[PDB]
Short mmCIF file of C-alpha atoms and ligand atoms in Angstrom, two decimals:
data_model
loop_
_atom_site.label_atom_id
_atom_site.label_comp_id
_atom_site.label_asym_id
_atom_site.label_seq_id
_atom_site.Cartn_x
_atom_site.Cartn_y
_atom_site.Cartn_z
CA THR A 61 -19.36 48.92 115.42
CA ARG A 62 -15.80 48.63 114.13
CA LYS A 63 -12.94 48.75 116.64
CA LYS A 64 -10.86 51.82 115.83
CA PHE A 65 -7.32 51.49 114.50
CA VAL A 66 -4.54 54.03 114.93
CA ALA A 67 -1.22 53.39 113.18
CA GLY A 68 1.98 55.41 113.38
CA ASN A 69 4.06 55.45 110.19
CA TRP A 70 7.48 56.72 111.20
CA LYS A 71 8.69 56.62 107.57
CA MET A 72 12.46 56.98 107.05
CA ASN A 73 13.12 58.65 110.38
CA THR A 74 14.58 58.04 113.89
CA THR A 75 17.93 56.93 115.20
CA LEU A 76 18.10 53.73 117.22
CA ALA A 77 17.91 55.66 120.50
CA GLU A 78 14.99 57.78 119.26
CA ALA A 79 13.19 54.66 118.06
CA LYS A 80 13.51 52.98 121.45
CA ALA A 81 12.38 56.14 123.25
CA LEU A 82 9.39 56.72 120.97
CA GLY A 83 8.28 53.11 121.21
CA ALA A 84 8.62 53.06 124.97
CA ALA A 85 6.74 56.34 125.41
CA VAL A 86 3.86 55.20 123.22
CA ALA A 87 3.72 51.80 124.97
CA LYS A 88 3.51 53.43 128.40
CA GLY A 89 0.69 55.67 127.25
CA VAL A 90 -1.53 52.95 125.86
CA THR A 91 -3.17 51.75 128.99
CA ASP A 92 -6.23 49.93 127.64
CA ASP A 93 -7.12 47.80 124.61
CA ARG A 94 -10.15 49.78 123.40
CA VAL A 95 -8.32 51.02 120.30
CA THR A 96 -6.01 48.93 118.13
CA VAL A 97 -2.65 50.73 118.18
CA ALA A 98 0.39 49.93 116.05
CA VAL A 99 3.72 51.61 115.31
CA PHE A 100 5.78 51.18 112.14
CA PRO A 101 9.53 51.77 112.52
CA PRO A 102 12.06 51.41 109.70
CA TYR A 103 13.35 47.85 109.28
CA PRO A 104 16.67 48.10 111.15
CA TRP A 105 14.99 49.14 114.41
CA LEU A 106 12.19 46.55 114.41
CA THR A 107 13.68 44.15 116.98
CA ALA A 108 14.60 47.07 119.28
CA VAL A 109 11.15 48.63 119.16
CA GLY A 110 9.48 45.22 119.48
CA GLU A 111 11.36 44.85 122.76
CA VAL A 112 10.09 48.11 124.27
CA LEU A 113 6.50 47.33 123.23
CA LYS A 114 6.47 44.08 125.21
CA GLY A 115 3.87 44.08 127.96
CA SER A 116 1.79 46.75 126.25
CA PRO A 117 -1.22 46.51 123.89
CA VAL A 118 0.77 48.25 121.15
CA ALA A 119 1.53 46.21 118.04
CA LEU A 120 4.60 46.40 115.86
CA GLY A 121 4.44 46.78 112.08
CA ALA A 122 6.71 47.15 109.07
CA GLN A 123 6.53 49.84 106.40
CA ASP A 124 6.74 47.37 103.50
CA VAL A 125 7.17 43.62 102.91
CA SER A 126 8.43 41.35 100.15
CA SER A 127 6.09 39.66 97.69
CA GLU A 128 8.19 36.51 98.24
CA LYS A 129 8.56 34.23 101.25
CA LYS A 130 12.30 33.54 101.06
CA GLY A 131 15.28 33.43 98.80
CA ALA A 132 17.09 35.25 96.06
CA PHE A 133 15.54 38.71 96.41
CA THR A 134 18.44 40.97 97.35
CA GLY A 135 17.40 43.90 99.53
CA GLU A 136 13.91 42.53 100.29
CA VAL A 137 12.50 41.64 103.73
CA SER A 138 10.28 38.56 104.10
CA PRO A 139 7.11 38.08 106.15
CA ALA A 140 9.01 35.44 108.17
CA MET A 141 11.64 38.02 109.12
CA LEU A 142 9.01 40.60 110.06
CA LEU A 143 7.10 38.08 112.18
CA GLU A 144 10.31 37.15 113.99
CA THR A 145 10.99 40.82 114.85
CA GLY A 146 7.54 40.87 116.47
CA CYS A 147 5.48 42.46 113.69
CA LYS A 148 1.76 41.85 113.46
CA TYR A 149 1.24 44.24 110.49
CA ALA A 150 2.79 45.37 107.25
CA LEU A 151 1.90 48.49 105.29
CA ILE A 152 1.43 47.74 101.60
CA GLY A 153 0.97 50.21 98.77
CA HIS A 154 1.85 53.40 100.62
CA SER A 155 1.62 56.39 98.26
CA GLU A 156 5.36 57.04 98.54
CA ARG A 157 6.02 53.52 97.35
CA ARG A 158 3.40 53.65 94.60
CA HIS A 159 4.30 57.05 93.17
CA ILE A 160 7.91 57.77 94.14
CA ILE A 161 9.44 54.27 94.20
CA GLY A 162 7.01 52.95 91.53
CA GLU A 163 5.26 49.83 92.87
CA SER A 164 2.68 48.30 90.51
CA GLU A 165 -0.72 46.80 91.21
CA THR A 166 0.71 43.40 90.26
CA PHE A 167 3.43 43.74 92.91
CA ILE A 168 0.96 45.07 95.50
CA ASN A 169 -1.53 42.24 94.91
CA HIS A 170 1.26 39.67 95.27
CA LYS A 171 2.48 41.34 98.50
CA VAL A 172 -1.02 41.25 100.01
CA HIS A 173 -1.38 37.51 99.35
CA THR A 174 2.15 36.69 100.49
CA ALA A 175 1.86 38.69 103.70
CA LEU A 176 -1.51 37.14 104.58
CA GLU A 177 -0.44 33.60 103.69
CA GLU A 178 2.59 33.87 105.99
CA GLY A 179 0.58 35.17 108.94
CA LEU A 180 0.77 38.97 108.86
CA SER A 181 -2.12 41.38 108.92
CA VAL A 182 -2.14 44.02 106.19
CA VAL A 183 -2.75 47.75 106.05
CA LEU A 184 -3.53 48.34 102.39
CA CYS A 185 -2.89 51.97 101.43
CA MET A 186 -4.76 53.64 98.58
CA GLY A 187 -5.85 57.09 97.38
CA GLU A 188 -5.83 59.53 94.49
CA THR A 189 -3.41 62.21 93.31
CA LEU A 190 -4.22 65.91 92.88
CA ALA A 191 -4.34 65.45 89.11
CA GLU A 192 -6.79 62.57 89.50
CA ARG A 193 -8.92 64.49 91.98
CA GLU A 194 -9.10 67.59 89.82
CA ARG A 195 -10.33 65.51 86.89
CA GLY A 196 -12.94 63.76 89.02
CA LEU A 197 -11.23 60.40 88.60
CA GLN A 198 -11.06 59.52 92.30
CA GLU A 199 -13.82 56.87 92.13
CA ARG A 200 -12.17 55.16 89.13
CA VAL A 201 -8.87 55.10 91.03
CA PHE A 202 -10.43 53.82 94.27
CA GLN A 203 -12.13 50.97 92.43
CA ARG A 204 -8.99 50.02 90.48
CA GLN A 205 -6.84 50.08 93.63
CA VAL A 206 -9.18 48.19 95.93
CA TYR A 207 -10.27 45.51 93.45
CA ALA A 208 -6.74 44.94 92.05
CA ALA A 209 -5.15 44.64 95.50
CA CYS A 210 -7.86 42.35 96.84
CA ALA A 211 -8.05 40.15 93.72
CA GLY A 212 -8.20 36.52 94.80
CA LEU A 213 -8.56 37.12 98.55
CA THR A 214 -10.86 34.76 100.40
CA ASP A 215 -13.61 36.13 102.63
CA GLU A 216 -11.65 34.82 105.61
CA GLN A 217 -8.50 36.69 104.55
CA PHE A 218 -10.38 39.99 104.72
CA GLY A 219 -10.49 39.53 108.47
CA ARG A 220 -6.86 40.65 108.57
CA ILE A 221 -7.22 43.63 106.21
CA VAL A 222 -7.31 47.33 107.15
CA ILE A 223 -7.65 49.88 104.34
CA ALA A 224 -5.96 53.28 104.67
CA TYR A 225 -7.25 56.14 102.52
CA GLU A 226 -4.54 58.71 101.99
CA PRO A 227 -5.13 61.39 99.47
CA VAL A 228 -1.71 62.04 97.90
CA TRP A 229 -2.31 65.80 97.96
CA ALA A 230 -2.66 65.44 101.76
CA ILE A 231 0.64 63.73 102.44
CA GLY A 232 3.29 66.01 103.94
CA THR A 233 1.56 69.09 102.50
CA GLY A 234 -0.28 70.27 105.59
CA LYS A 235 -3.45 70.16 103.52
CA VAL A 236 -5.71 67.66 105.25
CA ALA A 237 -8.89 66.42 103.64
CA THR A 238 -11.83 68.08 105.39
CA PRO A 239 -13.61 65.51 107.54
CA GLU A 240 -16.48 65.65 105.07
CA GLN A 241 -14.13 64.92 102.14
CA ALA A 242 -12.53 62.03 104.04
CA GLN A 243 -15.96 60.68 104.86
CA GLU A 244 -17.04 60.79 101.20
CA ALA A 245 -14.00 58.79 100.13
CA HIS A 246 -14.35 56.26 102.95
CA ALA A 247 -18.05 55.80 102.18
CA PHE A 248 -17.23 55.09 98.54
CA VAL A 249 -14.49 52.59 99.42
CA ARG A 250 -16.89 50.81 101.77
CA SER A 251 -19.48 50.66 98.98
CA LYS A 252 -16.93 49.05 96.65
CA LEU A 253 -16.30 46.35 99.25
CA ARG A 254 -20.04 45.84 99.72
CA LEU A 255 -20.89 45.46 96.04
CA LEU A 256 -18.16 42.93 95.31
CA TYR A 257 -17.47 41.26 98.68
CA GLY A 258 -20.77 41.64 100.54
CA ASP A 259 -22.20 43.28 103.64
CA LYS A 260 -20.27 41.41 106.31
CA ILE A 261 -16.91 42.36 104.80
CA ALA A 262 -17.93 45.95 104.04
CA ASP A 263 -19.28 46.62 107.50
CA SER A 264 -16.45 44.87 109.38
CA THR A 265 -13.36 46.22 107.56
CA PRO A 266 -11.70 49.23 109.20
CA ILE A 267 -11.07 52.09 106.80
CA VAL A 268 -8.67 54.59 108.34
CA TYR A 269 -7.74 58.09 107.21
CA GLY A 270 -4.23 59.15 106.35
CA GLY A 271 -2.78 62.51 105.37
CA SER A 272 -1.77 65.53 107.42
CA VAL A 273 -3.50 64.17 110.53
CA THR A 274 -2.68 66.28 113.59
CA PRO A 275 -4.06 66.36 117.15
CA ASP A 276 -5.95 69.55 116.13
CA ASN A 277 -7.97 67.88 113.29
CA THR A 278 -8.40 64.28 114.54
CA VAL A 279 -11.70 64.80 116.43
CA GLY A 280 -13.59 65.95 113.33
CA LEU A 281 -12.17 63.07 111.32
CA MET A 282 -12.82 60.48 114.07
CA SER A 283 -16.50 61.46 114.31
CA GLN A 284 -17.27 60.58 110.69
CA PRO A 285 -19.36 57.40 110.33
CA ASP A 286 -17.08 55.58 107.87
CA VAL A 287 -13.79 56.72 109.38
CA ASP A 288 -12.39 54.02 111.68
CA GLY A 289 -9.13 55.60 112.79
CA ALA A 290 -5.95 57.04 111.35
CA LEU A 291 -2.73 56.25 109.58
CA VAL A 292 -0.53 58.93 111.13
CA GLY A 293 2.59 60.28 109.41
CA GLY A 294 4.70 63.09 110.82
CA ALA A 295 2.65 63.39 114.01
CA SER A 296 3.62 59.82 114.91
CA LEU A 297 7.24 60.87 115.55
CA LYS A 298 6.36 62.58 118.82
CA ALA A 299 4.80 60.34 121.44
CA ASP A 300 2.46 62.97 122.86
CA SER A 301 0.95 63.95 119.49
CA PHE A 302 0.57 60.32 118.52
CA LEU A 303 -1.06 59.45 121.84
CA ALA A 304 -3.42 62.43 121.51
CA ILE A 305 -4.69 60.89 118.29
CA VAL A 306 -4.98 57.43 119.90
CA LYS A 307 -6.99 58.85 122.80
CA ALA A 308 -9.29 60.70 120.39
CA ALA A 309 -10.15 57.38 118.72
CA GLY A 310 -11.41 56.06 122.05
CA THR B 80 48.20 45.43 93.01
CA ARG B 81 44.60 45.74 94.15
CA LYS B 82 43.65 44.41 97.59
CA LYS B 83 41.14 41.62 97.07
CA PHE B 84 37.53 41.99 98.17
CA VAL B 85 35.20 39.17 99.15
CA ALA B 86 31.57 40.01 99.94
CA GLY B 87 28.83 37.70 101.16
CA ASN B 88 25.33 38.55 99.94
CA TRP B 89 22.94 36.62 102.16
CA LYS B 90 19.93 37.87 100.16
CA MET B 91 16.51 37.29 101.75
CA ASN B 92 17.64 34.48 104.03
CA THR B 93 18.49 33.63 107.69
CA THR B 94 16.60 33.82 110.94
CA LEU B 95 17.96 36.06 113.68
CA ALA B 96 19.74 33.12 115.34
CA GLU B 97 21.19 31.93 112.03
CA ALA B 98 22.35 35.45 111.22
CA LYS B 99 24.18 35.77 114.53
CA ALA B 100 25.76 32.33 114.13
CA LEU B 101 26.87 32.95 110.54
CA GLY B 102 28.32 36.34 111.37
CA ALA B 103 30.16 35.01 114.39
CA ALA B 104 31.58 32.03 112.50
CA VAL B 105 32.83 34.19 109.65
CA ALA B 106 34.32 36.73 112.09
CA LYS B 107 36.23 34.03 113.96
CA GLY B 108 37.65 32.68 110.72
CA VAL B 109 38.99 35.95 109.40
CA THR B 110 42.23 36.14 111.25
CA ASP B 111 44.19 38.66 109.16
CA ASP B 112 43.46 41.81 107.15
CA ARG B 113 45.04 40.74 103.84
CA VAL B 114 41.66 40.49 102.11
CA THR B 115 38.78 42.93 102.53
CA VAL B 116 35.85 40.86 103.82
CA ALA B 117 32.25 42.01 104.22
CA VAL B 118 28.92 40.33 104.93
CA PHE B 119 25.50 41.62 103.87
CA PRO B 120 22.57 40.52 106.05
CA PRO B 121 18.96 41.56 105.49
CA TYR B 122 18.07 44.87 107.16
CA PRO B 123 16.37 43.60 110.34
CA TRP B 124 19.46 41.67 111.46
CA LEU B 125 22.05 44.39 110.81
CA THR B 126 22.54 45.54 114.41
CA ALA B 127 22.74 41.91 115.62
CA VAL B 128 25.33 40.89 113.03
CA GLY B 129 27.26 44.13 113.55
CA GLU B 130 27.61 43.10 117.18
CA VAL B 131 29.12 39.68 116.45
CA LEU B 132 31.57 41.19 113.94
CA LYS B 133 33.08 43.50 116.55
CA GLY B 134 36.76 42.83 117.14
CA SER B 135 37.19 41.19 113.75
CA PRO B 136 38.37 42.59 110.39
CA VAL B 137 35.00 41.72 108.84
CA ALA B 138 32.86 44.63 107.66
CA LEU B 139 29.10 44.87 107.69
CA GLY B 140 27.07 45.88 104.64
CA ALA B 141 23.47 46.35 103.53
CA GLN B 142 21.82 44.81 100.47
CA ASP B 143 20.30 48.12 99.30
CA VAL B 144 20.04 51.76 100.43
CA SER B 145 17.71 54.70 99.87
CA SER B 146 18.45 57.41 97.32
CA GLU B 147 17.39 59.89 100.03
CA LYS B 148 19.04 60.90 103.29
CA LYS B 149 15.95 61.18 105.49
CA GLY B 150 12.24 61.74 105.52
CA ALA B 151 9.02 60.82 103.83
CA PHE B 152 10.08 57.66 102.00
CA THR B 153 7.98 54.90 103.53
CA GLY B 154 9.73 51.53 103.54
CA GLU B 155 13.17 52.93 102.64
CA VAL B 156 16.36 52.69 104.73
CA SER B 157 18.73 55.67 104.86
CA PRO B 158 22.54 55.76 104.78
CA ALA B 159 22.42 57.27 108.29
CA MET B 160 20.50 54.24 109.57
CA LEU B 161 22.89 51.82 107.88
CA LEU B 162 25.93 53.62 109.28
CA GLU B 163 24.42 53.48 112.77
CA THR B 164 23.93 49.69 112.49
CA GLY B 165 27.66 49.46 111.75
CA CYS B 166 27.61 49.21 107.95
CA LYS B 167 30.59 50.28 105.91
CA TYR B 168 29.08 49.17 102.55
CA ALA B 169 25.87 49.09 100.59
CA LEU B 170 25.15 46.99 97.52
CA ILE B 171 23.54 49.05 94.76
CA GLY B 172 22.05 47.81 91.52
CA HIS B 173 22.00 44.09 92.26
CA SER B 174 20.53 42.18 89.31
CA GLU B 175 17.54 41.05 91.38
CA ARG B 176 16.74 44.67 92.12
CA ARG B 177 17.32 45.82 88.54
CA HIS B 178 15.40 43.07 86.78
CA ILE B 179 12.90 41.64 89.27
CA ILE B 180 12.08 44.70 91.41
CA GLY B 181 12.72 47.15 88.52
CA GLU B 182 15.26 49.77 89.65
CA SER B 183 16.23 52.32 86.98
CA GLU B 184 19.58 53.85 86.12
CA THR B 185 18.26 57.18 87.42
CA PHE B 186 17.48 55.61 90.81
CA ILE B 187 20.81 53.74 90.88
CA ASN B 188 22.84 56.86 90.05
CA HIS B 189 21.04 58.80 92.80
CA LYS B 190 21.67 55.97 95.30
CA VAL B 191 25.39 55.91 94.50
CA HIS B 192 25.75 59.66 95.13
CA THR B 193 23.58 59.62 98.26
CA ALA B 194 25.40 56.65 99.78
CA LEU B 195 28.83 58.16 99.10
CA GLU B 196 27.86 61.65 100.29
CA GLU B 197 26.63 60.24 103.61
CA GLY B 198 29.79 58.21 104.23
CA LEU B 199 29.16 54.69 102.94
CA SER B 200 31.28 52.76 100.50
CA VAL B 201 29.46 51.28 97.51
CA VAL B 202 29.46 47.94 95.74
CA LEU B 203 27.98 48.78 92.36
CA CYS B 204 26.50 45.67 90.71
CA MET B 205 26.25 45.35 86.94
CA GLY B 206 26.08 42.70 84.21
CA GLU B 207 24.16 41.45 81.19
CA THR B 208 21.20 39.11 80.72
CA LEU B 209 21.21 35.92 78.63
CA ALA B 210 19.24 37.70 75.91
CA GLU B 211 21.80 40.51 75.84
CA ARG B 212 24.72 38.09 75.82
CA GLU B 213 23.30 35.99 73.01
CA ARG B 214 22.90 39.10 70.87
CA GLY B 215 26.44 40.27 71.61
CA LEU B 216 25.19 43.34 73.45
CA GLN B 217 27.22 42.83 76.62
CA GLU B 218 29.69 45.67 75.89
CA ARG B 219 26.85 48.14 75.17
CA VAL B 220 25.22 47.14 78.47
CA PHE B 221 28.45 47.35 80.47
CA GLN B 222 29.14 50.85 79.15
CA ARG B 223 25.58 52.06 79.79
CA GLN B 224 25.58 50.65 83.33
CA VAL B 225 29.00 51.85 84.41
CA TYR B 226 28.81 55.34 82.89
CA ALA B 227 25.19 55.96 84.03
CA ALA B 228 25.86 54.83 87.60
CA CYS B 229 29.10 56.80 87.90
CA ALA B 230 27.75 59.96 86.24
CA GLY B 231 28.90 62.97 88.25
CA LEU B 232 31.23 61.12 90.64
CA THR B 233 34.42 62.92 91.57
CA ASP B 234 37.77 61.17 91.21
CA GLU B 235 37.98 61.11 95.01
CA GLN B 236 34.60 59.39 95.31
CA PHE B 237 35.86 56.48 93.21
CA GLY B 238 38.11 55.59 96.12
CA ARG B 239 35.05 54.11 97.83
CA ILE B 240 33.69 52.21 94.82
CA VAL B 241 33.87 48.46 94.15
CA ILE B 242 32.28 47.12 90.96
CA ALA B 243 30.69 43.66 90.95
CA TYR B 244 30.21 41.92 87.60
CA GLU B 245 27.40 39.41 87.82
CA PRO B 246 26.17 37.88 84.65
CA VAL B 247 22.41 37.45 85.17
CA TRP B 248 22.51 34.00 83.54
CA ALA B 249 24.97 33.03 86.31
CA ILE B 250 22.84 34.00 89.28
CA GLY B 251 21.25 31.05 91.08
CA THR B 252 21.51 28.89 87.95
CA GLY B 253 24.62 26.92 88.81
CA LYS B 254 26.07 28.11 85.52
CA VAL B 255 29.18 30.08 86.43
CA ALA B 256 31.01 32.17 83.88
CA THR B 257 34.22 30.34 82.94
CA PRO B 258 37.18 32.16 84.47
CA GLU B 259 38.13 33.24 80.96
CA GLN B 260 34.64 34.68 80.35
CA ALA B 261 34.73 36.51 83.69
CA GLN B 262 38.16 37.86 82.86
CA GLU B 263 36.97 39.18 79.48
CA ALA B 264 34.10 41.07 81.09
CA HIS B 265 36.27 42.46 83.90
CA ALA B 266 38.91 43.58 81.41
CA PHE B 267 36.28 45.43 79.40
CA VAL B 268 34.82 47.13 82.48
CA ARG B 269 38.30 48.23 83.52
CA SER B 270 38.88 49.65 80.03
CA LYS B 271 35.67 51.67 80.29
CA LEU B 272 36.92 53.19 83.55
CA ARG B 273 40.30 53.92 81.98
CA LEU B 274 38.98 55.67 78.88
CA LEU B 275 36.61 57.97 80.77
CA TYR B 276 38.13 58.25 84.27
CA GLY B 277 41.84 57.62 83.67
CA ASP B 278 44.57 55.15 84.61
CA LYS B 279 44.70 55.73 88.35
CA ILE B 280 40.99 54.99 88.77
CA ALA B 281 40.99 52.05 86.35
CA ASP B 282 43.96 50.35 87.96
CA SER B 283 42.89 50.99 91.56
CA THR B 284 39.19 50.03 91.46
CA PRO B 285 38.40 46.47 92.55
CA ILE B 286 36.21 44.59 90.10
CA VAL B 287 34.83 41.45 91.71
CA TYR B 288 33.03 38.50 90.15
CA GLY B 289 29.55 37.42 91.10
CA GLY B 290 27.43 34.48 89.99
CA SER B 291 27.41 30.84 91.02
CA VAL B 292 30.72 31.20 92.85
CA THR B 293 31.53 28.06 94.85
CA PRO B 294 34.65 26.88 96.71
CA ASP B 295 35.26 24.50 93.76
CA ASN B 296 35.52 27.28 91.10
CA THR B 297 36.98 30.23 93.06
CA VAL B 298 40.68 29.45 92.44
CA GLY B 299 40.36 29.70 88.65
CA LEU B 300 38.40 32.93 88.97
CA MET B 301 40.78 34.43 91.57
CA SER B 302 43.81 33.85 89.35
CA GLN B 303 42.51 36.04 86.51
CA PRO B 304 44.39 39.36 86.20
CA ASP B 305 41.34 41.66 86.28
CA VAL B 306 39.36 39.69 88.86
CA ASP B 307 39.81 41.22 92.32
CA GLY B 308 37.59 38.99 94.43
CA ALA B 309 34.01 37.80 94.62
CA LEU B 310 30.46 38.80 95.38
CA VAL B 311 29.23 35.51 96.83
CA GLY B 312 25.55 34.51 96.82
CA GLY B 313 24.29 31.16 98.06
CA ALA B 314 27.72 29.98 99.18
CA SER B 315 27.84 32.87 101.67
CA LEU B 316 25.11 31.26 103.81
CA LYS B 317 27.48 28.61 105.15
CA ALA B 318 30.48 29.94 107.03
CA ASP B 319 32.89 27.26 105.84
CA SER B 320 32.12 27.72 102.13
CA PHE B 321 32.31 31.48 102.48
CA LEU B 322 35.61 31.29 104.35
CA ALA B 323 37.03 28.91 101.73
CA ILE B 324 36.43 31.63 99.15
CA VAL B 325 37.96 34.30 101.42
CA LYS B 326 41.08 32.18 101.96
CA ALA B 327 41.40 31.58 98.21
CA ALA B 328 41.55 35.35 97.66
CA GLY B 329 44.60 35.54 99.91
CA1 CA C 1441 -22.69 39.03 103.23
CA1 CA C 1442 45.21 59.30 85.53
NA1 NA C 1443 6.80 43.21 90.29
NA1 NA C 1444 1.56 57.87 106.43
NA1 NA C 1445 13.31 56.65 90.93
NA1 NA C 1446 24.99 37.92 94.86
#
């Protein structure tokens, strides 16, 4: 039985005041530790949101992280910086970064190692595009993404890995995967872990669903055997809709 | 006579305490407004450094900025966010982002427009690699970089542009361009502005030198007719070395 995991990806949204308010409202609403809950503000607000999360079970996370630990990497944010702001997690490989910004598997694999080595936990994002789906390539893509990102990880390092399945066709489109479609993808990802990394790792690693998650569809998704929670996009920007999803994971 | 411009690029360095201390020490040392001075902390420390710069002439800047104004761009930081932290400037096209991260001219051109439209001023970084230099391609590169980044800018928008020439061979290598080499590059860049954008823009736009600038070499660089200041890397991490360069631009 995997502890459920509900993460709120605020993306490139919120003013400083809105960030503080959203963080504080989510913190106040998370009144037990039965579900792992984390929120992911944009970099400039991390120390401010970290402050309002103090005294609550809610973790702080960053939306990206450098592949390097320090130094001459203009514009990049290091694991050390994120840890100092209060982060426990970093998202790596989000579809917007893979497909719009253009991050490679080499870069993603380096980020995973660097984040873990420095003491962060990692939410590794993966998933297929509409074009890939329509050509039945989703299993090829899932295998490439999972095995490339995890290349070189120790068994122990997997203890700090969460995988987020986000079909790209489901992001910001209002077209959620049916729970049955989500379940099929999660089951395949778990099988890929099992065949290469073994039963303990496959059965212990949370695989969470991302993509057009809303309070109206979360129950069906949450009930699926290989779905361990949610990576929430737009619905994470309102505290009540985010908390509704958290409470559904309980 | 162009007002000189001295910018401190802290890159992926400093703890929160160190950032506050460095900002405060630079602020205290800048006791007139004869030189435009700006410091560029990593994103998470921007509000903290903005605070310690209050009441001084020193401006705040960011090391990068999104090409988009808001929304579903995980990991990206918007002009609106930067402005709220107190930023007046954003660096765009730094060599580490062009060559290590992999930012394209399309992305850079979009960033320049987006930053300017939202109210930021822009430090556009450009410059050639060792391979390009050795093959005498530097003028081809300078033209491509300047004309691609500025494509579509209005004459009025140029009022908020600074160009930084950083030869890539000079970054972090301890091999500064001789002042005469810097001057040749700056003169060529200014000619490219003149031939396409006219005399007013060419003669008014600050072109600053970046790359292994140190208090020991700044005077020779500062004296060159087409050098209008410095984009300072490693030397910006100590307040006294940074201030020495600021005072030399006076
Ligand atoms: Ca096993
Ligand atoms: Ca003219
Ligand atoms: Na890379
Ligand atoms: Na998301
Ligand atoms: Na792009
Ligand atoms: Na620099």
